[PDB]
């Protein structure tokens, strides 16, 4: 019951991507008081589905928050399996294009180019942290000097840990890292976030439950824990028996989706992002 294509009222459409005859939109929310030579931060959600399916009407609430915060909130459209029969590495190349084209475009959007957030939900929050960690695999066709890194990150029980090497998996699967190549399109550790855990990357905040059946909370763990050892802010907020998806709107009374926006919203104070309320 989230249409694809989503109506988004109230957002301005942009093309940032045009790729295998389709054309990948920014759905994007202005503050009320925005005008051209502003130098707001940015936030560009993407929306989760196992990289299959999905739209960008799943963050159209948190677009409306943020663009009330005074950011340029924006839900971006990617290449999925079932509507594009793209791999998991393609979905990352249309995120990393996001991010560029949102720096490239940064004047004429009123934002800065360097508070430019990435964030999404699970498979979503996968391409969130690949735009943060995760070097680039292939040379766009469009905007090719411009960083497609993301300055901080705000991820919704993203997919973290893509490859099982470095792991303690008692066998040696050598056999289930093959097969991995031929899902996601690419060497598994190239769009594995925790295997390119290193200092001096951007700021981030992730929001998972401890009930999850889907990405295990241990491995989030595991990842925030290596990523504060490496001296990168990297802030960890479980739910305790929260299950996948707890922090959409429409769930639960809503009240684990407005606990992630203040809480999201105070990291973004943290880091400077965003003026304090009032
Ligand atoms: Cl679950």
Same mark, same amino acid.
């Given at each position: 019951r989230?249409?694809?294509?989503?109506?988004?009222?109230?957002?301005?459409?942009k093309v940032y991507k045009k790729v295998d005859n389709v054309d990948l939109k920014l759905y994007i929310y202005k503050p009320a008081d925005w005008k051209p030579a502003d130098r707001r931060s940015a936030i560009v959600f993407f929306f989760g589905g196992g990289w299959q399916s999905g739209s960008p009407?799943?963050?159209?609430?948190?677009?409306?928050?943020?663009?009330?915060?005074?950011?340029?909130?924006?839900?971006?459209?990617?290449?999925?399996?079932?509507?594009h029969n793209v791999?998991?590495?393609?979905?990352?190349?249309?995120?990393?294009?996001?991010?560029?084209?949102?720096?490239? %475009?940064?004047?004429?959007? $009123?934002?800065?180019?360097?508070?430019?957030?990435?964030?999404?939900?699970?498979?979503?929050?996968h391409l969130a942290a690949c735009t943060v960690m995760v070097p680039d695999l292939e040379a766009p066709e469009e905007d090719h000097t411009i960083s497609s890194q993301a300055n901080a990150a705000i991820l919704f029980n993203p997919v973290l840990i893509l490859s099982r090497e470095g792991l303690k998996d008692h066998?040696?699967?050598?056999?289930?890292?093959?097969?991995?190549?031929?899902?996601?399109?690419?060497?598994?550790?190239?769009?594995?976030?925790? %295997? %390119?855990?290193?200092?001096?990357?951007?700021?981030?905040?992730?929001? %998972?439950?401890?009930?999850?059946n889907t990405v295990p909370f241990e491995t989030i763990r595991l990842f925030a824990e290596a990523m504060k050892k490496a001296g990168n802010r990297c802030?960890?907020?479980?739910?305790? $028996?929260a299950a996948h998806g707890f922090f959409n709107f429409g769930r639960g009374d809503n009240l684990a989706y407005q606990k992630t926006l203040e809480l999201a919203d105070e990291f973004l104070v943290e880091i400077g992002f965003l003026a304090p309320k009032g």
């Amino acid at each position: 019951r989230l249409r694809y294509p989503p109506e988004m009222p109230g957002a301005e459409v942009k093309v940032y991507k045009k790729v295998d005859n389709v054309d990948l939109k920014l759905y994007i929310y202005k503050p009320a008081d925005w005008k051209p030579a502003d130098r707001r931060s940015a936030i560009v959600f993407f929306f989760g589905g196992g990289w299959q399916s999905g739209s960008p009407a799943q963050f159209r609430p948190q677009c409306e928050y943020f663009a009330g915060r005074g950011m340029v909130a924006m839900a971006a459209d990617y290449r999925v399996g079932s509507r594009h029969n793209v791999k998991v590495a393609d979905c990352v190349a249309d995120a990393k294009s996001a991010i560029r084209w949102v720096r490239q %475009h940064a004047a004429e959007l $009123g934002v800065d180019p360097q508070k430019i957030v990435a964030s999404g939900g699970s498979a979503g929050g996968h391409l969130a942290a690949c735009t943060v960690m995760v070097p680039d695999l292939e040379a766009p066709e469009e905007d090719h000097t411009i960083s497609s890194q993301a300055n901080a990150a705000i991820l919704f029980n993203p997919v973290l840990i893509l490859s099982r090497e470095g792991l303690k998996d008692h066998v040696p699967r050598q056999d289930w890292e093959e097969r991995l190549r031929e899902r996601l399109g690419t060497e598994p550790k190239a769009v594995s976030p925790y %295997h %390119h855990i290193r200092a001096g990357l951007p700021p981030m905040i992730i929001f %998972h439950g401890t009930a999850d059946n889907t990405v295990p909370f241990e491995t989030i763990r595991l990842f925030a824990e290596a990523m504060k050892k490496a001296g990168n802010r990297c802030e960890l907020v479980p739910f305790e $028996g929260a299950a996948h998806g707890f922090f959409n709107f429409g769930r639960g009374d809503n009240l684990a989706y407005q606990k992630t926006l203040e809480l999201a919203d105070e990291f973004l104070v943290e880091i400077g992002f965003l003026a304090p309320k009032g």
